[PDB]
């Protein structure tokens, strides 16, 4: 449940169109059979997670050095909507206006 920030690494100027992708697994060849990698082998229990993205409006809090420490998603729930309405991570009593 912790919070972390993701840095920019590279921006390659390629310009080709991408619509599908596929991962590459480093297969281990248990070279005890004459069928090479087309035969009996063994490896670990690797797995991974893939998620997609959609356009959203986010509120970001910068600390005193310049690293993001907490973010608020605008379209989550009424508290999130109010906290996005006025720039603050804390709100006081009353009645507030939204979309």
């Amino acid at each position: 449940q912790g919070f972390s920030a993701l840095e920019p690494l590279v921006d390659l100027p390629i310009g080709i169109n991408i619509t599908r992708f596929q991962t590459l697994l480093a297969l281990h060849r248990s070279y005890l059979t004459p069928g090479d990698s087309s035969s009996g082998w063994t490896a670990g229990a690797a797995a991974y997670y893939v998620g997609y993205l959609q356009p959203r409006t986010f509120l970001l809090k910068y600390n005193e050095n310049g690293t993001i420490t907490d973010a608020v998603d605008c379209a989550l729930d009424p508290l999130s909507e109010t906290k996005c309405t006025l720039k603050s991570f804390t709100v006081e009593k009353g009645i507030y206006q939204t979309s």
Partner: protein
Amino acid sequence: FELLHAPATVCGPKKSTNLVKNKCVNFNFNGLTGTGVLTESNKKFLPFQQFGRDIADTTDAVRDPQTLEILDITPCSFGGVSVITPGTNTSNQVAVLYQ
């Protein structure tokens, strides 16, 4: 040549001039233009940061593309001018004031 099938990636390096400071001058930082005086800074940028901001349309720090140095921008001194008069009905003297 080919005509804009991809982002531009082939052209000259452009000539840089020696760095000067302590007197407010025009500047160009390959993406930043304007006029101001450049002073030594005390903030610490992240390694991948280029230029800082304080509020909308406010640039407060620029990273040197040569030596990775942080410089602070301060606009040239300016202000309105006013004239103090005892009225031409009596005499002709002025006490010009800078604000």
